[PDB]
């Protein structure tokens, strides 16, 4: 059920703090990297931090944060690209993707686009 989102750009797992803060971590042991990907509509998902009990949201300024409740900003188009990596594109801000920098900090949505390694993720099983 619970997955971990491994980013190709540095090998960071997307982390959601109980705080609402979003970042990346390389440690498989981190309790805040276990995510629940729920289908809404065919090919649309919401991303929940199991432990944080919050939903990933993208703001109109490209910020990444985690919300206590589900809003129009918590829906993403989940796509299996040619390379077998998944991309998560904001349903509201249709040009922006969830992305992580090779630093472990998230990348502003407004700076993302196709061809970038930052937007590539590999959903893995949460069995460390």
UniProtKB/Swiss-Prot annotation:
In its miscellaneous comment, the UniProt entry states: This protein binds heparin more strongly than does aFGF.
Which tissues is this protein detected in according to the database? Expressed in granulosa and cumulus cells. Expressed in hepatocellular carcinoma cells, but not in non-cancerous liver tissue.
Q: What is the recorded post-translational modification? A: Phosphorylation at Tyr-55 regulates FGF2 unconventional secretion. Several N-termini starting at positions 94, 125, 126, 132, 143 and 162 have been identified by direct sequencing.
Q: How does it assemble?
A: Monomer. Homodimer. Interacts with FGFR1, FGFR2, FGFR3 and FGFR4. Affinity between fibroblast growth factors (FGFs) and their receptors is increased by heparan sulfate glycosaminoglycans that function as coreceptors. Interacts with CSPG4, FGFBP1 and TEC. Found in a complex with FGFBP1, FGF1 and FGF2. Interacts with FGFBP3. Interacts with integrin ITGAV:ITGB3; the interaction is required for FGF2 signaling. Interacts with SNORC (via the extracellular domain). Interacts with glypican GPC3.
Sites where Phosphotyrosine occurs are at 55
Where is the protein localized? Secreted; Nucleus
Q: Name one GO molecular function term.
A: growth factor activity
Upon changing residue 21 to E, the result is:
No effect on integrin binding
Q: What is this protein called?
A: Fibroblast growth factor 2
**Gene Ontology cellular-component terms listed:** cytoplasm; extracellular region; extracellular space; nucleus
Site note Important for interaction with integrin, residues: 101-102, 107
UniProt function note: Acts as a ligand for FGFR1, FGFR2, FGFR3 and FGFR4. Also acts as an integrin ligand which is required for FGF2 signaling. Binds to integrin ITGAV:ITGB3. Plays an important role in the regulation of cell survival, cell division, cell differentiation and cell migration. Functions as a potent mitogen in vitro. Can induce angiogenesis. Mediates phosphorylation of ERK1/2 and thereby promotes retinal lens fiber differentiation.
Question: Which family is this protein grouped under?
Answer: Belongs to the heparin-binding growth factors family.
Provide this UniProt record's keywords sorted from A to Z.
Angiogenesis, Developmental protein, Differentiation, Growth factor, Heparin-binding, Isopeptide bond, Methylation, Mitogen, Nucleus, Phosphoprotein, Secreted, Ubl conjugation
Region feature Heparin-binding, mapped onto this chain: 101-117
Tell me what gene encodes this. FGF2
What's a single GO BP term from this record? nervous system development
| Chief site of localization | secreted
> Crosslink site(s) for Glycyl lysine isopeptide (Lys-Gly) (interchain with G-Cter in SUMO1)?
68
**Which residues are heparin-binding?**
9
Name the residue ranges of motif: Cell attachment site: 19-21, 61-63
């Amino acid at each position: 059920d619970p997955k971990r989102l491994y980013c190709k750009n540095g090998g960071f797992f997307l982390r959601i703090h109980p705080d609402g803060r979003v970042d990346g971590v390389r440690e498989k042991s981190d309790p805040h990297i276990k995510l629940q990907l729920q289908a809404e509509e065919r090919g649309v998902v919401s991303i929940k931090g199991v432990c944080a009990n919050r939903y990933l949201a993208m703001k109109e300024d490209g910020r990444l944060l985690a919300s206590k409740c589900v809003t129009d900003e918590c829906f993403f188009f989940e796509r299996l690209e040619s390379n077998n990596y998944n991309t998560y594109r904001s349903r509201k801000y249709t040009s922006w993707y969830v992305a992580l920098k090779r630093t472990g900090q998230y990348k502003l949505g407004s700076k993302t686009g196709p061809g970038q390694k930052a937007i590539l993720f590999l959903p893995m099983s949460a069995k460390s």
